[PDB]
Design a protein around this ligand. Sequence first.
Ligand SMILES: NC(=O)c1ccc[n+]([C@@H]2O[C@H](COP(=O)([O-])OP(=O)(O)OC[C@H]3O[C@@H](n4cnc5c(N)ncnc54)[C@H](O)[C@@H]3O)[C@@H](O)[C@H]2O)c1
Ligand SMILES: NC(=O)c1ccc[n+]([C@@H]2O[C@H](COP(=O)([O-])OP(=O)(O)OC[C@H]3O[C@@H](n4cnc5c(N)ncnc54)[C@H](O)[C@@H]3O)[C@@H](O)[C@H]2O)c1
Lengths: 474, 474
Amino acid sequence: DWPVYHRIDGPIVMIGFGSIGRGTLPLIERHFAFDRSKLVVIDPSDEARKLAEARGVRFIQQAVTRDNYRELLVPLLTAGPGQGFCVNLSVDTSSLDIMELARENGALYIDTVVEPWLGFYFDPDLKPEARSNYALRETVLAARRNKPGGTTAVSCCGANPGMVSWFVKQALVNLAADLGVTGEEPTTREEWARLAMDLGVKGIHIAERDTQRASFPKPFDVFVNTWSVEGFVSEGLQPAELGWGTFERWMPDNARGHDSGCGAGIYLLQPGANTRVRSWTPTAMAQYGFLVTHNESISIADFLTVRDAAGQAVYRPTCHYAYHPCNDAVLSLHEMFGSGKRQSDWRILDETEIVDGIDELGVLLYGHGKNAYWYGSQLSIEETRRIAPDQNATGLQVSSAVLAGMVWALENPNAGIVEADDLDFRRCLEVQTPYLGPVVGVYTDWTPLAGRPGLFPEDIDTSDPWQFRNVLVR
Amino acid sequence: DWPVYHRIDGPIVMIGFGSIGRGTLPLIERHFAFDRSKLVVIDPSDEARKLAEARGVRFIQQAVTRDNYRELLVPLLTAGPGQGFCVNLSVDTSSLDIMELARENGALYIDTVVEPWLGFYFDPDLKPEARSNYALRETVLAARRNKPGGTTAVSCCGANPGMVSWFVKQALVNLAADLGVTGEEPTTREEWARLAMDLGVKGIHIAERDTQRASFPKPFDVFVNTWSVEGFVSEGLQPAELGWGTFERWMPDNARGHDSGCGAGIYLLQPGANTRVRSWTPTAMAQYGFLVTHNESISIADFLTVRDAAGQAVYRPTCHYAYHPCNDAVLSLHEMFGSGKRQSDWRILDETEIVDGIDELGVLLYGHGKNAYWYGSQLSIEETRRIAPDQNATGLQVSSAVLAGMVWALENPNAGIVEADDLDFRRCLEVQTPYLGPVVGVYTDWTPLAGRPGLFPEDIDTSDPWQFRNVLVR
Ligand SMILES: NC(=O)c1ccc[n+]([C@@H]2O[C@H](COP(=O)([O-])OP(=O)(O)OC[C@H]3O[C@@H](n4cnc5c(N)ncnc54)[C@H](O)[C@@H]3O)[C@@H](O)[C@H]2O)c1
Ligand SMILES: NC(=O)c1ccc[n+]([C@@H]2O[C@H](COP(=O)([O-])OP(=O)(O)OC[C@H]3O[C@@H](n4cnc5c(N)ncnc54)[C@H](O)[C@@H]3O)[C@@H](O)[C@H]2O)c1
């Protein structure tokens, strides 16, 4: 039967009960020991309230805001007898501020995104740079520098960001092994970074194809998705963003860097969900992905940076999302950008509404001796239904990653603010793998120059197929 | 009961029996008197053969080619008694060569496209300019100059090109009435061009939204459309192309003109089916269309050109396609361009497969005192099934236009080579309108600058919303 990993000795406060909350709650109940009355869910939605009442869980129907979060969360997280756990799966709330509050009060914390308080994403007085995930991530890095160590808080530990950081480490180990390179696997950041450099990894796509289909066709003027519509549109409207490799020799005219921070990122002055890149997955083969900004695009490139004695970067991989969402979400983006405004309505596909499909989610390492290697999960909706309730394949990859992060935080409770790249990737994947369906590594000889140039002139670099110049759809 | 317009006493030679041929044959049998035995269908496919045999129509299973078309077609065209009619609804055949052969033998001719002999659309030695619909149309204009008058041959008389020319004339008439512009209805090309100028029509979109949906979801690696997949992909991979208005102040860097010809066009060094434009239809409201090359983009702009004494163009409207095909076709394009190659299979949706939807097809006249005016057909699949067999709503708009052109040609059989713009639009709409469902004119305050600029800097022209600079998706 199911492993019980740990006792939680205090309140469990779940903030948000949308698609990921609904998928995560049963895993928390499944895999942790605690008094049922210790758990409470906070969400402003009536829909969420009715579901929570049906599950028999405590529910507080309230939006967490800048104005009320201290008054609301501090008593709940410190109810005792010991250390509680704040599980933040919301939108419109500040990850940074709630995280800092949890840490001040000795409660563990996990989220799946660096979310700002409501109002941030569409503030007209904000420059595009300030709306970037690079900038949000830097607030977390600064918080860590200001308060090193202390109670563990896990930032951005979903499927992506989150799990895919663990896939990158496993992929690097697999590439090395497949070359006949034997020896101790890296243990430090510097060793991982040098492994990527030594293997000649030029860059990484977070290469995803969602093939989940609904029993009903896409309705006119309804945005459809397999996870948060609000969250997807939000990130989709942020600037296109990528971790920027040292091998790159070209960037578009509307690309910009950053004055400060870890130094690993650029962004484009255009929305990521209307930016296309040429990419590849085992089931899709060659496909367009959208260049949607993601925390791990920066965090992985940062993690895998090799610096010289002077502190200058001598190696860093390119890293970015290449997202092909479900067909109805592709159509939803076409409708939204085509109308110049958000649809009147939206819906997230429930498992009962999905006829078939998978969420194929992995990391595509390219530029090395075997050209390209994809490593990740091919979780189907059929398998999902067999092993976890109240979610689709997309949800389960995320909720199981939150599970793994919670297990790691409980096992390593004095580690301070950490990213998915900081966790024991083997332990996390050990906890998560029961919920990931097939997990496979696949080589391909495909490159962004396959079939090019065609019948029109193209600005391409034939000496280096994986240059962003060739990947970006222009 | 249905009107029988004329008796056809000679052979009726239908070249091609795909989606449009299948929809047109029943209309021909319905609306003309002739012995069924004088009908002959020529198509290389087994599928076409089985369908023709089921209809009891003579069938020749041959591909018409540059090598055989004279030997194959001349005896069919001249079998008598009296004048034959060549109804050309094929792919991979030269419209020009077959047209000249019909004329040389005294047979009437109609088609729905200026198609080249097989090999042209992907000939690697052709310059982009030579692959343009402008260049193909010039071969027809040259033929007309070379042999003025003579037997009627109707070039490009489907739904679009074809019907939309008649919609432009009716729209201009409606606009004049609404804008209070006085004068007699134009009766010459020169008078039409002057009316468009006097109304201040800056440009015209062929503004289409197809909402037909199938009872099955789009299959992976299958291109799905409501009409010719081969024909759609061929034109989609031709350069983006537009009739170019005198009001335009900007063209993109990869835009090019023509050294010779009528002078009304430009093209872009990129495929039209992967080129988006901001447009509008009554059912879609604001939407993306694809800037797919079309004969009427050039023919309508050329037709509405006003010249001074020197022969210099002083007024010309912009004119181009702004096509939003059915959702499964939108997905098919994303798949094809994302993979960089055609799908391994394709299918055209049958009326028996379509669960609902319309083919909303009209002309959007803009820049005048009432901003924009859309005029056209909103034909539904439900209505289509009630009034015509063996076709969906897209098919019926095309087949009924072919019917109209055939009636016109019989009533005007010595008019020489003509385009849809040369036909009497009232007579043609009188024949076609019973098959068009609701035909409506709608005004809108929408412009391409609606909601712009937004979150990111945009290269827009704020002085004139309808500039191509604002329409083209960059
Ligand atoms: N790392 C990853 O892989 C990953 C994957 C999916 C989702 N996410 C993130 O997880 C979060 C949730 O995703 P989802 O699919 O569950 O979203 P969702 O849209 O389905 O649900 C969001 C929930 O948050 C609630 N909410 C809104 N304002 C709130 C407030 N002030 N306080 C508390 N709750 C509030 C809503 O009522 C809703 O029920 C999002 O922020 C999303 O970006 C991360
Ligand atoms: N103006 C318009 O509005 C409009 C609209 C639709 C279609 N069209 C055009 O009309 C034509 C037909 O469209 P469709 O939907 O019927 O196409 P389709 O693909 O369904 O059918 C094309 C037919 O042509 C046949 N064919 C191929 N090679 C041939 C040859 N060498 N000789 C004779 N026949 C041959 C095929 O076997 C097939 O049955 C296409 O060229 C298309 O572009 C125009």
